Amino acid sequence: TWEVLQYKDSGEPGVLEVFVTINGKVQNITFHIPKTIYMKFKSQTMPLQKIKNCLIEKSSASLPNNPKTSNPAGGQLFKITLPESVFLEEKENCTSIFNDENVLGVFEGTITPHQRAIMDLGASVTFRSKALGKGIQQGFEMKDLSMAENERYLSGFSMDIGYLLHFPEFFSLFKSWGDTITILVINASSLGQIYKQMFEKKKGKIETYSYLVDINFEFVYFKLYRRLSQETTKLKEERGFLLLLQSPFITKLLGTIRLLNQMPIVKLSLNEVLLPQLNWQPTLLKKLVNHVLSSGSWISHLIKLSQYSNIPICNLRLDSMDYIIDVLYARKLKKENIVLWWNEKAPLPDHGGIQNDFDLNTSWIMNDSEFPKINNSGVYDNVVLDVGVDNLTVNTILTSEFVHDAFSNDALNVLRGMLKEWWDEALKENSTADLLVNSLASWVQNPNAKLFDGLLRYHVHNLTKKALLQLVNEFSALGSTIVYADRNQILIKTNKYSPENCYAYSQYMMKAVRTNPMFSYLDLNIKRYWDLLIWMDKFNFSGLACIEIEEKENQDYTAVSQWQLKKFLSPIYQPEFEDWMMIILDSMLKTKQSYLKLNSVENSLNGFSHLFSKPLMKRVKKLFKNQQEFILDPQYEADYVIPVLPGSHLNVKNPLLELVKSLCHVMLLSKSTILEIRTLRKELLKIFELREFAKVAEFKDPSLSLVVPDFLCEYCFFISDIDFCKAAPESIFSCVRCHKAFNQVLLQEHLIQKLRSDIESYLIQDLRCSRCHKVKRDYMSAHCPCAGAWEGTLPRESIVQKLNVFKQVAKYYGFDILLSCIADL
Ligand SMILES: [Zn+2]
Ligand SMILES: [Zn+2]
């Protein structure tokens, strides 16, 4: 029984070395692992070439279901296990088994012996030879003697540590058993005071993790760049000890220092560190001191994760949570009869070489990430409940030959059982299982993780959409009206009128929804209660809301107003807008309260425009007169300047016209007092020399939309869309729940990916006839057999407008990568 610290392949094929903890100190052992591949060689009779030393057997493993691969053809799959060296010298010649006729492809040729060892053997390896000397002088073979013992506790750790860092010439070193600090090319006092300060700040953590790492030390700030090798040599011939390295140039520092390859290393890469160009010393002191005094917590977390996941400590990382998913899922599939389709250095599943070819179906299922939503605009006097839904994806996963687009059902059941046991273990006080469940969704989304298949992602997305529509159906079964629907927020209209009377009722819908077996794992929460709502859009609403209904006391009512429409008005009329909107909201609240006092038409709101009609008429007359008098003056031209914003497309002249158009369009959403609003609109338009149904008096959307689907916040595993045009600032650059700033070049890269996907989709579109809407079924034909000529399903003007709005977006903010992408066309 040995606790393995690291697995590492040698420069020889199939030869591996392990830094392992022998019963004494650390020690290194050389291994040998043969290769194993999956082949579809000939139909049923093959040129075996049995003289070559290999083990050949016909198997019946479960192959992946490629959408392009519709013909089973031959089915005599073969498992081939074969030492790597003979594979290398047989790759040289052409007349060999691996390259012959009717070779459909190899399925497990991209799995290194390192990965096979780390999955099948694990960290808890032992021997049952019952030749130890002969096997220790040489490399001991694995495939004949192999078994994994239990790993409940890895080891009782008591051993020194290493610490090498770099901040883009801030190379740093520290020894746990040493007592000196020297930094490569006021500072000493700051270092001492900061060390003491955070010492008292984290006394508790220091005391708890002292048994892992344990104190003041000297300070120094030192041609000079050759000292890394000398220090590494001093440490190497002074101690055997584990290296903690932190730098954005991991491989560069590994290659520059030749001695770093002879000890096990635990890596703590947290890159993207920058200097503020001034007073970098205090912040760098903060960074180094927090890293040093949190190293104990870091190594404790790594020890927990390693001794739970059966993974060596040097192969793990704090952010490499997808690695555990991959390891566990791969080993459970290997215990099954399913090929792993494991892939390396490529974010695509391995299919035997077929995946290299372009295909229409795969490309269509790759870029179809749009999530639809439901929005029923209108004016509501009833109470509305604002709720949020959580853990939707995991509930969807756990809940629920002919179809060529299907994802393998055996893998789906395997992962469903894996997630079920994960949930069961997480319920019984397991933080690791909780974090793993939280990161499962991000593992599903991210193509960077191995064992990733676009078919699985499309399957999960379609299932999520179906589950959401089923939830909408269940909600609408009772007395309800869905106003807004989304992956994160749902607005429900309540049939009642008073918020105080919806306590038990809302609790009853909550309980009934939760008890449904389809929605057993959903988490639902109530955020706000709406007394009076004017809802037309997610970014455009205003009304009176109460946070939570209280007992025996009148609730606190606060008015809110979110309106990007006001941002497109003239600078001098926005005060008029914000005044008159509040006035009309007050009048609406007054008339609803009066109607409730008294007791498709509703009398709660009928008769509200009568309160403010005459003052509005006089105010509009005065505003028109003043605009007429002061529009041509030079010094008054500042306040009449029409603002420009990204996504704007309307060119228009008179601001007062758009002011009154927006004011009337807000009222028009009543859907029950249409005639009164139309009469008032005609009366207002009579002040101008316009008519009731003129084209100039029609309100439109002053802004376009540019939505990016499923942006991921790593700090929350939070998934949401983001609109670059309609949304207000200081929200594009930060998460919705947490206030963490987003990376910018990531935003530009995602925008460019969206643009290129749009262009490709336009390029690969289909053709449709004019009179009949049948699709083109010939590669070359003048026109339809009937009358009419072909037209594209994707109009040119749409993509032209999309590129125009992309240009506007790239011009408003500073996005030089996107501008370079545009200029290359
Ligand atoms: Zn966040
Ligand atoms: Zn036709």
Q: Which of 124, 88, 109 is nearest to 15 (CA)?
A: 88
Residue 140 one-letter amino acid? F
CA 201 / ligand 2 centre spacing (Å)? 78
Task: Report every protein residue that has its C-beta within 5 angstroms of ion ligand 1.
Answer: 713, 715-716, 718, 735, 738
CA 779 / ligand 2 centre spacing (Å)? 16
Q: Give the HSE-up count for residue 737: Cα atoms under 13 Å, Cβ half-sphere.
A: 13
Give the burial string for 607-627 (b: 16+ CB within 10 Å, else e). ebbebbeeebeeebeebbeeb
CA distance 495 to 493: 7
CA 785 / ligand 2 centre spacing (Å)? 6
CA of 716, nearest ligand number: 1
CA 783 / ligand 2 centre spacing (Å)? 7
CA 714 / ligand 1 centre spacing (Å)? 7
List phi, psi (to 5°) of 513. -65, -45
CA of 719, nearest ligand number: 1
CA 768 / ligand 1 centre spacing (Å)? 44
Beta strands in 481-606 (DSSP E): 481-485, 489-493, 523-537, 540-546, 558-563
How many residues belong to the chain?
825
SS3 27: strand
- Provide the Cα torsion 334, 340, 345, 349; round to 10°: -160
Q: What are the start-end ranges of the H helices in 162-221? A: 187-201, 203-209
Per-residue tokens: 98: 């691996």
List phi, psi (to 5°) of 88. -65, -45
**Bridge partners for 542 per DSSP:** 534, 561
CA of 781, nearest ligand number: 2
CB 164 within 8 A of CB 173: yes
CA distance 770 to 787: 8
CA of 772, nearest ligand number: 2
Q: Which of 581, 586, 595 is nearest to 497 (CA)?
A: 595
Q: Give the HSE-up count for residue 339: Cα atoms under 13 Å, Cβ half-sphere.
A: 28
CB 761 within 8 A of CB 367: yes
CB 456 within 8 A of CB 444: yes
CA distance 340 to 737: 37
Non-local (6+) Cβ contacts of 813 within 8 A are 646
Output DSSP code: residue 345. S
CA of 731, nearest ligand number: 1
Helix (H) or strand (E) holding 117: helix 113-120
Residue 179 one-letter amino acid? D
Q: Provide the annotated binding site for [4Fe-4S] cluster.
A: 769, 772, 784, 786
List phi, psi (to 5°) of 507. -60, -35
The strand order across the sheet containing 242-246 reads 172-173, 161-165, 242-246, 265-267
Q: Provide the annotated binding site for Zn(2+).
A: 713, 716, 735, 738
